[PDB]
Amino acid sequence: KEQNGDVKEAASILQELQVETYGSMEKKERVEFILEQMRLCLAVKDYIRTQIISKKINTKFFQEENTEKLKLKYYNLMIQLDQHEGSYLSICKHYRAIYDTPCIQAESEKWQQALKSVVLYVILAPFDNEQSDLVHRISGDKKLEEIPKYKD
Amino acid sequence: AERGYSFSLTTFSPSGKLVQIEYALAAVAGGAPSVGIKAANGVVLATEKKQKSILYDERSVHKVEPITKHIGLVYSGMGPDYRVLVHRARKLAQQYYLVYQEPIPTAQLVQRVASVMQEYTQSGGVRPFGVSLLICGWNEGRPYLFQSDPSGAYFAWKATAMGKNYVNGKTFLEKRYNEDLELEDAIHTAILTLKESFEGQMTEDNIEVGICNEAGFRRLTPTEVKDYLAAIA
Amino acid sequence: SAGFDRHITIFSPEGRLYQVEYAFKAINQGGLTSVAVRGKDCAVIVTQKKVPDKLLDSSTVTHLFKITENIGCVMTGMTADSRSQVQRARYEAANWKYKYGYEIPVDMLCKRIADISQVYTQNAEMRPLGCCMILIGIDEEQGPQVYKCDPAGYYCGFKATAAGVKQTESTSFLEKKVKKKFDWTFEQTVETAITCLSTVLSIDFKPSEIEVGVVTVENPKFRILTEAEIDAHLVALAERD
Amino acid sequence: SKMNLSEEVDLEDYVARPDKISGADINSICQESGMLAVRENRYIVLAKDFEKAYKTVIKKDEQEHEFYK
Amino acid sequence: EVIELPLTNPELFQRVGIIPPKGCLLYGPPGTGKTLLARAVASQLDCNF
Amino acid sequence: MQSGIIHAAEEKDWKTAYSYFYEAFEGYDSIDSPKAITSLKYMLLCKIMLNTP
Amino acid sequence: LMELLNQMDGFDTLHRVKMIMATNRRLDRKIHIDLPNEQARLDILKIHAGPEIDYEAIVKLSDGFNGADLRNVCTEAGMFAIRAVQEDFMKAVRKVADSKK
Amino acid sequence: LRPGRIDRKIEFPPPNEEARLDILKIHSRKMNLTRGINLRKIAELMPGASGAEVKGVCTEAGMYALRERRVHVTQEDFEMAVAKVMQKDSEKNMSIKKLWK
Amino acid sequence: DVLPPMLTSDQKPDVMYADIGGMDIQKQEVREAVELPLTHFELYKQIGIDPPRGVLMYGPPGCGKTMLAKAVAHHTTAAFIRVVGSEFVQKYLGEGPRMVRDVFRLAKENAPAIIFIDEIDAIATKRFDAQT
Amino acid sequence: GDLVGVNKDSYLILETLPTEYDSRVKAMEVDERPTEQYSDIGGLDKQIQELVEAIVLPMNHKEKFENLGIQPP
Ligand SMILES: Nc1ncnc2c1ncn2[C@@H]1O[C@H](COP(=O)(O)OP(=O)(O)O)[C@@H](O)[C@H]1O
Ligand SMILES: [Mg+2]
Known about the structure:
Radius of gyration of chain H: 18 Å
Helix content of chain F: over 70%
Structural class of chain H: mainly alpha
Protein name (chain E): 26S proteasome regulatory subunit 10B
Strand content of chain H: under 5%
Bound molecules: adenosine-5'-diphosphate, magnesium ion
Subcellular location (chain E): Cytoplasm; Nucleus
Binding site for ATP (chain E): 28-35
Organism (chain J): Homo sapiens
Radius of gyration of chain F: 10 Å
Largest sheet of chain F: none
Family (chain E): Belongs to the AAA ATPase family.
Oligomer: part of a larger assembly
């Protein structure tokens, strides 16, 4: 449906599965289903449903062996949601998780984009105690490549 | 309270109560609302025929039943006991007709039905009738509305309500009832008194109403009850 | 209030008959269930049939009785009480036909049985026999008729009813199915009854573990459907459902 | 007030519908309708949810014996 | 159906769940699986008894 | 309507004032009286003064 | 019960505090259970078989509710005749038949 | 009740309208009674009422005065207080009322 | 030296008069009985009245009377001791009366206070002639 | 939980004590073993057999119980 030039109703078709109750073989098929629900909801601009679905995924599962593309896509979706919502420290935290992901941490540009995003979304957040703590942490990351612009 | 003297019907409690007949009257008060109003030129009886489901064919068992061409009867209480009492009332009316070639007066029918209830409330192996009857007749040239209790006591009423919300019904009738009320207005008063204690939507086919004018007692058809409900609302 | 409990004739301080209520509990004691539904021009009773032994003659085991040529009943509850009340119903129908010269109306037979039961509920001579009788017949002026004769003198007429363990579930199912096009045909009524039993019991029926009796306007004689007819109904209606 | 609903969910006639529901009954109705919505996802509370909850609560007072009446 | 309560809280926000329910009755005959019935579900939930 | 007016005037319980105004509106609507626009106006006024316009 | 200070709860102010009450005859829910099962006794016996045709053979006449059935099977099988883990087959059927309840 | 243990036994009948006038005066002494107010009329309006009932009558009339930001009590206030305090919960059911002739 | 010296009236309920819809007359009466005396006593003294301490709220279940009790407890300035009438029927001889005495003594010691007895029908019924 | 001698005043754990059994607990044991029979109890063959199993068999034939997966209550 989504491929056939109509997503408004294709989102509804997919937004009916109770994958948490279905009982898949493991937490892989269900997680893929949930992330695709997320993607369709964001495509149709249904951020309330997107947030509700996000609360249905336990991030602790992403600290596993093959949960790398899943982690990357899930986070990218969270950044999209928070970018619409207007927040910036949550976007920072999501980009920082993306950076911490080893797959992102195995190529020059791949990790450099994540680190620039983390720096910029530290900067864009309002000044609070937590924001200052994150500023200090990113400053002490030591892997900033001393890029003459973001470092300064 | 007097706990020992509440299982038998042939013993006075130390204070003189006959507790079991009062318990029968409690069974009466825990029944479907019914209302009776004695208009100036007739009488009207109403009672909720609300069923416990849509499956109950609400056209087979009636609650407002005739006993003669000029007497009818409704009840509040248990339906089986009501059936027994209506059969006995019909039999008594027929006996009176055979003896005296004249329709039984409403007062006499009430006396005899109360006597039947007394017969049933005077032994240990028999349970008092757990119903209160409202009899409405057009003997002579004036209307009669009577009540008969399990105890065998019978009353003459201007207007009354019995069942679950009889207190509210009687207060409403005190507010609304006036002696010089035509039967057409009394029907509206009866239906309104029912509404004040009728949960759910009072559809034409879940309420039962019977009038008693000089033409004789007659249970209003559901079409007529629908017309009255529409006019009232 | 437990003192007002051992005698059928004692009113509880709030006006309740605990022994009558216990008779109803006795209805819900045979384990079986029964359902009845009336269409435009037919009435159908279907009863769960348990034969938990190879030595028990299934032909003799039954809960559908022919009260008269044109009236049938399904009994649920204690079997001895069921058969006693069936004999009483047959006797009353025979007396009616003898005295008045025409076949007893179904509603009249139900009223007679309900009055007989009310007598026991009022006087203290017997226990109220704990069985529920669902009667079906064809009335010449009204059409198909289904009635109940519970053991307290209550006998309301029904568009569709159930009795036994799962009477509440069957009642809910039939309410839902009758709010939508209560107008049923013969096949549709048999479908509705059998489906109600199957869904409430959570089982699909073999042709033998079910007993169906039917009356129709065209053929107003209580007929107990044979195994072949039951199997035909089950297979055809499950296939075309 | 604390709950939030749609714009076509007027309580303005559920009040008018005759019944003997008490304050506890109304609170139960509201809670049950909210639970219906959350259980069925459908991230709004609507007139159908209130209708079902109202029917459930009002009909809860049943399943008694019918010769008593 | 009691696992919705902890994993998220849409019961707040638009609606109110009066501190959404704290479980179901688990109506059971003399004994079938009551304890283990709850054990397995809570083990899935990762909660503790 | 008079009870709602007095409640609005004196106690500053505009919730109760609105309740009474709605009852008056319903009665005057059933009677189809011309004193129903006033009851509607007063309900809207109570809604405004409740800081929920 | 001769205790009335133990009235209902309602002190709830913490998240993740769900309860599970269990009895027979706020919490507004319920889950009916039946003591037997239509065919689940097969799986009950298979899972309790700590030490399938004979499982079905036991199930034909099986009428039970818990794993005490299979525990009795195993003990009354091993410690009675074989001395006098499979190797039981119809012996478990014999035990379930012996089940008196 | 044997004498020697309880030598004397004093009955306290409800006031006989003169004791009621006395009690009204006693409990209205500390009160701003308007002119033309007839405690004798109130006493007559209170038949078979105890001293507690009379004190409650005074208190409830005072509460009526308090309601209307007043420090003033009038005959209407006492009459309404009498009505509110001597409110009887007579039998509801005419059947139970008419069992006895 | 003397040490500064308890059992109830500490968990101030969160309900408030604004949480209750309608029930205007009952709210007014309960206020006049239990709140006005403790805040505006000059009002009662000026008329020369003893405030009506002690009220009864009778009615069908689930009509917000325990909730009004909790509302007065919330907007209470002194103390609110809550008990249930069925809690006075304990087994051992002469303990229901002992707890009644303890509750009232606790209120007196805790100075201006509001006792609440949720279901008094258990104990406070027509006295009747006992025989056991 | 252990029996240790302790200095009276400082209450410091001095040399430890192995075990203490009350005189009554020592007497709480059969010195002269009773001996009549099993056949000397009639009627309750089922109960005697069940008790013999559930007590003695775990004591002597312990290994077979865990071999077969039996929990000897
Ligand atoms: N007037 C009211 N306004 C709001 N809620 C009410 C009201 N009356 C009752 N309730 C509801 O009923 C519950 C309390 O009922 P309760 O006061 O215990 O009744 P009762 O004490 O008569 O049994 C509360 O949870 C509340 O939500
Ligand atoms: Mg309460």
